[PDB]
Amino acid sequence: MFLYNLTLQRATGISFAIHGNFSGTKQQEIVVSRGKILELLRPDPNTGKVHTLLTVEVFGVIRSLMAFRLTGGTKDYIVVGSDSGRIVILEYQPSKNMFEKIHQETFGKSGCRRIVPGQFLAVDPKGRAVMISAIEKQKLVYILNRDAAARLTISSPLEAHKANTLVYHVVGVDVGFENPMFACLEMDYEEADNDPTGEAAANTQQTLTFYELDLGLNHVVRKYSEPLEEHGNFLITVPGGSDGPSGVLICSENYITYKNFGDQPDIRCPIPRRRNDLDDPERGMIFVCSATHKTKSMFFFLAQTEQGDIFKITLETDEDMVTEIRLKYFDTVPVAAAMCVLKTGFLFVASEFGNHYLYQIAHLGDDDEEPEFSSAMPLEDTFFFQPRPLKNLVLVDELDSLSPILFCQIADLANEDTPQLYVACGRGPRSSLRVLRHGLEVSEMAVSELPGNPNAVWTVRRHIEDEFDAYIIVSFVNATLVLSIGETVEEVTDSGFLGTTPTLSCSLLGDDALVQVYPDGIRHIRADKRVNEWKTPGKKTIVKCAVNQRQVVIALTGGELVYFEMDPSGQLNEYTERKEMSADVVCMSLANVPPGEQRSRFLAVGLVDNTVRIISLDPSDCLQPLSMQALPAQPESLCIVEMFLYLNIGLQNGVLLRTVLDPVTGDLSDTRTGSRPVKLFRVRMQGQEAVLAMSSRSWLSYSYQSRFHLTPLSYETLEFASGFASEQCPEGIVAISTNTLRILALEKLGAVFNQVAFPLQYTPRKFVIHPESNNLIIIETDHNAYTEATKAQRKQQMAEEMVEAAGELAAEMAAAFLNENLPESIFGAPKAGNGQWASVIRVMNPIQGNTLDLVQLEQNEAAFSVAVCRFSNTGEDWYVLVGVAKDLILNPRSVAGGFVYTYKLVNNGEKLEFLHKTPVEEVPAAIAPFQGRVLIGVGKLLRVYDLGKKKLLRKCENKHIANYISGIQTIGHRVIVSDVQESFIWVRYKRNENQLIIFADDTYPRWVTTASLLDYDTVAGADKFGNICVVRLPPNTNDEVDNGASQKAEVIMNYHVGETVLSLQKTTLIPGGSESLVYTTLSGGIGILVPFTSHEDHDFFQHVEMHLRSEHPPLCGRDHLSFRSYYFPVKNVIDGDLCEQFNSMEPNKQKNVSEELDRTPPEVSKKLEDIRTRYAF
């Protein structure tokens, strides 16, 4: 079983985000750091949207991302700290749309070790040196200096290790071109490890040590060091030198203390909290992230707290020292992992969970009534900051991507044939039920019904220099309608077309002249009021036409071709010859003229005899055949386009065949576009020439980084389409529907999979699909939370305690506190507690966004498993059994008891009625039907329970589990239970004696998170360490039986995906293709594993991967085999993402790899695209 892993949707969760002039121009870029891929974003200052400029997979876990620039430079570098033992300096090359590695020096071994540097990386603000240190006992500082040819060069690194010392966070000090210092939070654990009494473990606070790097001595030494009052989580580098005083702000729990080095006194300020907070008072408050905005006049800081309270941090200072720290709450934001303050009022909010946000710095945060707690302001009591809406920034854009690794069910719940990916993703109040469909979002800007039966649509501008269209032509069956698009589009008659007849084509020939194509003749309309007519010769009529930028080809009846040439004086000149064809013309195509050239060379003409022929339009070989190509069906439409150009041709059936643009016909490709005639329409998508198909599904083909990408439209089918450009619609497409006109536009680039999210209340765990009701039953449970009735009781207790102060008693803040309900999705969820939880069961229809029913659990109730099936003792009534736990949290708090509630699923799965709630001694984490009964796994006890009138009667029990049953997949004959730290084992259930016997086990333990049965003896399971494994039972294993087990199961496939997988499903993503092992990720990524059908193709893919591992190394300095062999060694796994870089790599290296593979680079591209077309959308 040789498989081939492929990525369908990249990871959208960002772990780090930097801002600066990475492109070397005045525009600032946003370098985002995903899980296993690097991303370069460029926000539009006019449009307010963030576009992905580049996206490259680093094939490794990047743990640090920082930017730096030398003195007097104009471009910011990119320092990337990954899990490898090498430091990589990257320099994005715009003149190539790729990140060029400047330097790469190895420092240690691979892996996320404690003694391996790469976890922390600080850069100097002057760009003189960079410091990379590990979590403990390792620290290195390399010097960066420019060469004579302005090239960045690195020197030998300086070792600065310290034994038995742990580093929390490091940051470089802002020095005015002096000796650079690197401040970091240190903690000596030597005394705590040599004291069994535990006295040395207590009273051991963190010590802020500032290590200075002597440039004259070429060595670093710990110059300054001072202990702190409390433990710190992160630091904030204050700019010094000419702009502000030097120093750093140390963030801590409920306190902030900026303590500069030297004679500067320590000034501390407590963290302000929200007024009348519903959270627990015993829990502290720390900062989550911090942003710095530096200007020539002054500088400010923006740090978000644990509740997402973004406060505007300001520091009053004297001539040489700091006076006080004045903080003020700017607005309210979600929990963001990184914040980037850009120029011209732009704030990028990269959320740690859920969709991201990009608030633009609107207000300065000052000049308001908001109370700004100063550092000098004494308090013995913390400035209770009020939760005021962010009235200083405006979300310019949102990157709501993936970061869940929760649950996903890929099924065709809708009426369409293509299955949708119903994936519940989110965290707490930001959770949502997103149904992902592979398509494209169409934004209908205008829609108006059209009389009669329209057959075509056209849009021609007034001038060649005009940036927008001016005339819109609608061709009916017996006439033609022309409209003028000036933001008030109505019926127009003075255009000069005189549409009393249906029109075949309408475009602009000259710079300001128009050309209309009719079967009764040709009509030329210049800039002035002049009509140049050209009637058809004889009684024949024009069947088809082909217009261009400087060419006009027309086809009459009987295969009579007529060529018209555009004179440089502005007139049209007909050809001196008429070429005849062997059959009638059914399709004609004319490519656009180049800006350098004056005319097009190739002209495609489709015949009725199922054959395509190319005709040269040069004056040397005009009306001469160039290349012929047979077609399996009658052609319907043809269109040639650039990106290196290819000519597409659509047939009358649901299939189309394309060919390259050359003097001879080269490679060919085809796909089932169908039960509809495939028409070809040219469009402008993202500033590039794209093709728009007209069939039962409207697919838009567009190339993306030397790789084609064609997704269908998520709308109704259309008959004709044309590109549109106006002031209201800058980039749109006018599509003609059945007796209706619709002006749509494709704003979002949803080529991967478009999603529609239905929001939930808490973090979901698993979802169940009802067979008869066709609905979704998802349970949303989250720890450290309270229920709705518990929150209402806490609010009532707070309102009772607020009136207990007896303040003149006469002040009623309860009417403003209890009535005002703050949104948990926007202003954060006020939830706390150690053992408290909040579970909620809700049944919602997948077609709509509303929920049919909702069931709230108890206060200390937390559901972990859910199943919906029927009982053998009962009739056809589907029962929904959901197991919950009582008093649970983490490993320190041992689980108390458990319960299993039963639902009736009344009104054909529209309402749930609680029948019984059977308790349990252990927490149930497994519920699955098995031969009319329900298998209940509570802890390490696997019990088979039956349906009872009072409680679930357990008919069987099995205590052979190692630690705890985490998952259970039941085959028709056997049962496969998945342990927590042990690998899954196969167990046979005897129906005669009601005794479950384990007949197979595994030899290697793995922290399994999800699994799926591939066959009767082969099972594939995920790993918590970011790997994927597939175990197959041996054929000599005896299921009838009575270190741990005798029969062992061999692992036939193992591959480290690098992301936490929690959902696996083997199904067909597209009808007609092959089924693949589609897997989800916790970082918002979707992947698919496809098995190899041919041994020669598998060997070719293995040779291509072996060539690519030597020709294109990863940018993170790690090895591909070492990344694939992180947890388990690779066995029959081919990474298609590394093979996809052959089109993005160098052309000479691609030609060398193709010569080593004895093929062509387009042949290798076609062989790579064939597996994707066979296995994916």
């Binding site: 169908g674 039960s675 009808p1071 007609g1072 293709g1073 020669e1096 064939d1170 077309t1173 066979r1174």
Partner: peptide, 21 residues
Amino acid sequence: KKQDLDDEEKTAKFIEEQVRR
């Protein structure tokens, strides 16, 4: 490779047909 390639083309056929459905 070539013989397989002949087969490969057929393989493509199935997927294309699937798309049509």
